[PDB]
Amino acid sequence: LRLQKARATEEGLAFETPGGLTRALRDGCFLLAVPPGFDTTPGVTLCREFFRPVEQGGESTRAYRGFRDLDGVYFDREHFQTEHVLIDGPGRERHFPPELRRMAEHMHELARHVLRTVLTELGVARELWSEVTGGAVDGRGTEWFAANHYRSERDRLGCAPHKDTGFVTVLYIEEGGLEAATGGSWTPVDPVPGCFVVNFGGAFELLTSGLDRPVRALLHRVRQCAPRPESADRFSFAAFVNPPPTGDLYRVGADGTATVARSTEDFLRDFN
Ligand SMILES: O=C(O)CCC(=O)C(=O)O
Ligand SMILES: [Fe+2]
């Protein structure tokens, strides 16, 4: 039922639970302590504001509203409760206020630290990390940030079932509703105070399917949120470390060699 829990150290991940990283790789997810001094306020503010007009709200948070009017970053899902902002690095440079930019950067830093820690533990040669991940390990992949608002007034599922497409996702949640497919059933992934949820995506699963401990990409969904006042709607925000939009990645062989190449576009294609 319950997830492994770790804290990020300078050297990697210190797991406080017995299953350690081995169990977390099988689970496709684990709990990660929010680092000391990390400020979640910008993300919570964005999730309460991004879908409202700039004129409708206080002046102090004007930079957090009006994302419906930007081009290519706001998405209203027609058959689900979620509406969201999905934005890459250059978009955040142009459209996020500095404190929000800093928090997203800190979350991507954590996600890259997780990626490096798992590559270390699986025995991937240090000199091939950049090649194998298309530079995502060094912060030169596509680094997506998502802010999700679950509109509980919609009589729909919260979020479609899916696997994340990239390597590592660092997710902030405060409410139940997230579920993971284990066996032929959905299992709840509930929030734990003082923790992020971390999950792995399809690119990490593709990279490692031949290793002694393959990384599983978590198949997950969000169940329909029960109706409640909008100011108390379920929200989440997350940073995703993905391969770059073009180029080859490389599957890792049993002896640590970066072996066969895999096309990022054929991968995204066969994904969806
Ligand atoms: O809201 C959640 O708990 C899940 C969010 C998610 O799966 C995503 O944004 O990719
Ligand atoms: Fe997801």
Numbering used by the authors: 6 to 277
What does the paper say about this structure?
Here we report the mechanism of three Fe(II)/α-ketoglutarate-dependent dioxygenases in bicyclomycin synthesis, which depicts the natural tactic to sequentially hydroxylate specific C−H bonds of similar substrates (cyclodipeptides). Three αKGDs (BcmE/BcmC/BcmG) catalyze site- and stereo-selective hydroxylation of inert C−H bonds in BCM’s (bicyclomycin) cyclic dipeptide scaffold, one of the simplest peptide derivatives without additional functional groups. Our hypothesis posits distinct regulatory mechanisms: BcmE employs steric hindrance, BcmC relies on inherent reactivity, while BcmG utilizes a directing group to control C–H hydroxylation. Although these three enzymes share only 35–42% amino acid identities, the overall structures are similar, and r.m.s.d. values are 0.70 Å (SsBcmE vs SsBcmC), 1.07 Å (SsBcmE vs PaBcmG) and 0.87 Å (SsBcmC vs PaBcmG), respectively.
To investigate the effect of the microenvironment of these three enzymes on the site selectivity, we attempted to determine the crystal structures of SsBcmE, SsBcmC, and SsBcmG from Streptomyces sapporonensis. Despite the extensive screening, we only obtained the binary or ternary complexes crystals of SsBcmE and SsBcmC, with Fe(II) or/and αKG, but failed for that of SsBcmG. As a result, we determined a collection of X-ray crystal structures including ternary complexes of SsBcmE, SsBcmC, PaBcmG (with Fe(II) or/and αKG).
